[PDB]
């Protein structure tokens, strides 16, 4: 389920977007309506504040509920890692996928996929905040099998990074710093 959900929107990360449910769930048929009714009930049910035992003990009990909800805050996300920790289940063992693949099949990461398009603008030497991804620890140029980019843009990227180094605007044996991640 996690992998099949990335094809619908490869430019974003999967998340519980509860704030945009209207475009997928009818307002009248919203299952969240139950919460509203339920939440009001819990408050109303706390008639013991001062009826029987008084405020003395009421306060004590209030802390109990806060703890309970905080502990169980991870229960609302089965796809998240929190679910597994709660139940205490062993990790998965996916089949070993070969590293060498034909060019027809490629699944670039969402974070780097958006940077490649650059709003339909070819990458140049001015785009310093994008060239930092296409460089290793030693500062060498990565191959076409790692960055997962097309043949035409692969040559253009090599030119932009090469020129930036000549201008003393890019490192030579290490990765850039946080103070140099800005376009020209």
């Amino acid at each position: 389920a996690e992998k099949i959900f990335q094809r619908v929107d490869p430019e974003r990360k999967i998340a519980p977007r509860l704030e945009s449910r209207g475009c997928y769930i009818d307002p009248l048929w919203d299952p969240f309506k139950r919460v509203e009714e339920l939440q009001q009930q819990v408050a109303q049910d706390l008639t013991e504040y001062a009826k029987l035992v008084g405020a003395a003990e009421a306060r004590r009990q209030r802390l109990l509920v806060r703890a309970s909800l905080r502990r169980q805050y991870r229960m609302h996300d089965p796809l998240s890692e929190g679910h597994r920790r709660f139940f205490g289940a062993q990790r998965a063992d996916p089949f070993p996928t070969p590293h060498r693949v034909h060019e027809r099949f490629w699944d670039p990461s969402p974070d780097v996929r958006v940077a490649l398009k650059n709003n339909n603008v070819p990458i140049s030497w001015r785009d310093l905040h994008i060239l930092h991804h296409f460089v290793g620890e030693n500062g060498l140029i990565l191959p076409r099998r790692t960055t997962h980019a097309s043949r035409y843009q692969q040559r253009c990227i090599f030119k932009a990074i090469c020129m930036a180094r000549r201008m003393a605007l890019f490192p030579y044996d290490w990765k850039p710093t946080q103070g140099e991640l800005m376009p020209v």
């Binding site: 339920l38 009930q41 819990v42 049910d45 706390l46 008639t47 013991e48 029987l52 035992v53 509920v65």
Partner: peptide, 18 residues
Amino acid sequence: IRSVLRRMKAQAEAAAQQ
């Protein structure tokens, strides 16, 4: 949370009434 709350409430009333 509601279930426990309700149940607890009734226990105090029975003891207090005597």
